[PDB]
């Protein structure tokens, strides 16, 4: 992708590989290969939970970016 | 928030769904430098994430149990009491959350932005809610277009998505908006190897979603609008 | 939150105190899949952390000055005014915090969970507080048992611990609940070397707390209930 | 521990070593050896501080996980 | 927050501005162990950061678009309605933020601390605000001096800085206090190389700010008080 | 600096280099060289934004330390 | 083994792991894990070859140490 | 050559065969510091290598095709012409090679040594050759014992092994002595993982050869003296 | 190349990058990226030297593989 | 030797010259398993190396001054005295060297092999030499085909190249055969980056030699048979 | 040294550190820090050994560069 | 060979002895480009190595037992039989070895070179030997000056050193020339740390030999010509 070539010339790479079988890991976690991140969009609403509806963001520890 | 020089978005940059190509803009608000910024429903991109992580009953590349995923996230919880009327100050009849990702024109110089918001809804009128949300969509579309001037970021599209639940009496609603920053497992890249990292991303950058499902032997959870938010 | 596939807990998985083996459950709430989930006072596990980090006057393997420790933490601060009566909306007579770690049945598939809460106490009745807290312990025990169903996590024990202070008039109370995620120094593992990483964990996974204190020449700060929370 | 063997076959390891003398460091800090974390439980209440009572979590920068 | 054993501060430890040497203390509050802790206006240190990152129109070593910078930050947003009088509970006429970095006497044993605060201002009296802020400066000076006893940290100077805006009617003010933790690019160290990491820091630890501007061919944005906060 | 010598004997180093051209990166980001951090002070107030006044902390994702 | 403990205190480790499936690799080859080596004894005589008799030291490039 | 502080020997340090424990010394030459250095037939150690690499028709953990293995090696090639008598200066009737590994008393201070030699044999008398070789064994035993003084290395055992072939007329004989320095594959350590490196060596350091063969499902090529050299 | 895919599944990779500007380096030299090697064929004969004729194998230290 | 699972050959695997595709076999010796092993003149492959390293007067990606390049090499030096006749035992009238690389049928299981030889020539008859060399080419072709059986390696082509110099009286000739094992610089891969290692090899694996020369702005030193050996 | 600056701009560094206590190690050995080498000159002649006279090149395995 | 872009020489580039500054050239042979190449006795540089490694009875930073040190080395062994006269073809009365390191004018473009040679001596005349060696010194001086043209390397000094032993009857002499390529231990750099690698070399590049001996508390084995070769 031309973008990656332009990006690599600045020192930036978008590589983000997880060493685990099946599972994704989070950006900045030790053992990941690459200096990038991949993101996605999840909006979901549930009642009685929201996190387990549709895209499963499992039993995860999240930290907030703002 | 932001995804910038180091990032890709599931469903747009990688594993792009043909719906991203099918998609007609809802309308285009004029962003400051003169460009018309098309606004699109992000339900393609949203469907793409569900495809990659899977669902609680058909779990695919979900984040590892106990991991630390940094997320751009907001979320609101509200209760509806058993039939009470002038209800307590943190209660309502419905709840909603929203997200918008806007792709920067030049990702080598400027970053792409996420807008996330969520709130509670006071009236019991579901039809009122829905209209307020289209109103709020149109609102976010504008703040983006405006606030980009301040850092002189120019975008090329914004993809906005919403999700909502009305509570029945004596039920609590939770609504969340989250964008996770993750790294991808090898048994997710057909032809991928822990030894070929950079090509691995290129594989995912080139496979479309339907191609990826076939290659992995996974049933398209998007199907034809199988997923409701 | 969660500690999962990559983690160990001081006092249970590593440096386990014989009290973990002495410990009788307080009671066992029935978790959804039919299993009875024993509930235990986490004061073993709590005493174990004090042993490893040490105290402000006998500091041991405390986190490095200026480091970034990601913590699962909640904490509450409240004031008691000089003898005033219908006191301001963020004041009270006492304060409390709580933590519960629940060990997953299968840590290869599900994660272990932390529940943390804290709040202020309005009456001056210390005896009322204490009972509310046992009530709240029993409450947390149940939410856990229930909410595990949603992600179908099955646990095998939960260890709940509490801490509280009553303020005297014109004094502010602070109460915190924190679970830190750290990495361990070499002069903490008897026989450990920077060159033998994986065995290092195994050493700590096999030494008991009393063994570790002897080996390191450290005085057991747990002693016989020397530590009050 | 059989668990670690099962875990290692998935790509996961629980190793978490700090390069420092005496001091522990936090998960995801550069220079740590291993791709795991060790956690513990601290509840303490103090008055006039709480953080300096009993288990000393020193002059630390904490970030919140939820 | 804290910056400790692993850190340096732009303008004091690295790229030190001769103003740090010119600077007279505003006054010295007595810290617990007997030492007098001089208090100084941090506008040197603040000017130094502006020099290194640059400004939105003359951008220098600003953090990479989309990066994750962990910050010690607080910030407040408040509105002033169109001329209304008994205005809504989260509105006011002005807004302010503050920061103080205090250098530890022994950075091998204790950490250096940041105090950050911010709030809204209710009266329209700009002259009242300014005095309250000097009052608040003097206040922070004391809390520091006191609270250091609790962990027995002894400091040697504290550098406190403030920033404020009065709103005109129908305008919102935003005020932020932030200390970022970053790593430095090679084309920032004259003579620096990706191959000489440790010496790179030493270069920056030895260049003064004016030297660095000359070497880099950058126009001193501090100039003579060109920057207002 | 004598401090760094004393510090290095404990396992601590204050090195923090960014691989990128022009740009700084944040502490704990993958690809940085060194196990340290460099910090600075920004207080700024603006009206209609604050973040873009004076020291440009660009289009950044911040996480809060407390 | 007490020896390894004594050795590790000097900076020496005898670890020598090959990343390959089935195959051993040689000391100092890139990608090996560890800073040690494992050796063995082969004396064999053949006629018509010697290298392929008994312990198979395959199609290998050897360099001589003396 | 030498194997020293970084090394282990297949069949003695790792995968030790019970024959190393069964083994009676052939005799003990007095090494310089007063110690008697037992001398043993290295056919245990030799059999152990064959076990680990396998044979050309039952290949096991042989070095990777195309790899660079640094070896301590010597080797001799000689021809026997078709029945000629006063044959050319680099011809003979037989050929031989030898190796001796001597384990140092203190491997933290001194290294362990390899002696390797090989030569051609002129007479057609196989019975003469064999006796010369025992004579040469006894010879090497002494040089070792002596030459250790020069660097003041003290050993505790020496294991010497020999191999030979008589040529028939019009056949060339090749004889080699080689000690390879290699690293070990994970599917060679039962219970081993690429993630547990140091423990991996410890597993191999503790398994005996028969144990390893059972665990791997490999047929003991040593059998009862199945291998001739 | 299908070969590399087959190879990578065994733990083998043929990557061999030199960090230097202009210059190639030799297999097993520190700082190279990758766990592979690239080879070529040089036969040259000269008189008066051979090494400097045609393919320049410069002022190099060679070690012999056999 | 050997180049095996970790290697590529300049001019065949990477930077392949169209001449490798133009090339007619000189003849095909029958290798042991029944396959006919075509034999080809390696002057394509040889020309390719000259292209990549360059020449002493137009130096390109030559190995770094002072580096350690492990080589498969043999080489011979011989003198011709001033007109003397029954010359000393290590003198002659000419000198020669040869190399052959043979590509393995299955490079995942077997390695590819190099045969290298060199010698001196006694007669002054250049025409005799040349014929001996074709005789020797044909000889090497056979040894390969045979000796592959011993390790059961099956090849698919062998590329043999020769080089020679006749001395005039009172001149010494040197002849060398060398195959270097190197790693490639980034300014050699068009589109290559230090950040994209694996793709870098793929770029070189796909560019042909003429393509590479154009892309780099280098003049084809092969030209039309510009190089003599 | 200006040379190192010029050198570093080409990708070359002369750093060569040994992880061991007291002992030097050889170029290209695993665990060394740096991508350079340090050399010296030893000529010695002895009779009866030469290697143990004057500069002690101990019980070392040498490989020949030419 | 060669030491080039990656290397330093003990006693010249690092730990330089004041004798390198005291040293008068023996003579200057004219190297091809017009420059006069001063020739110097390398006994400074040689003494420096002895200082750093130490001696068999006062061992300092000697290479680790069992390590692999790549060396540029040549060495010769010869015997003198018990008084025999027309002695066997590989015997003589004396033995010698030599080394010369020549520093390149531009070490960013060209490498520095080592010349090493050694041989046996046939006559019993020690006085004849010595003169032949000065003759041979002068010889090497020239070959260097000449052969540099071929690769157009220009040097600025050459440091040549020799060593020799005459055998008494019935004694074997061994003479070796070796230049090792090593990496340096931390307890060798005063002020050095494993954490400051690049500065470590700079420390050694700046300390003189006498300075280093004082700092380390080591007795100068050079003393005033204490070392004979």
UniProtKB/Swiss-Prot annotation, chains B, C, E, H, J, L:
Residues that bear Pyruvic acid (Ser): 1
Active site, renumbered: 116 (proton donor)
Protein name as catalogued: Histidine decarboxylase alpha chain
Protein's organism: Lactobacillus sp. (strain 30a)
Phylogenetic classification of the source organism: Bacteria, Bacillati, Bacillota, Bacilli, Lactobacillales
Shown part of the complete sequence: 83 to 311 of 311
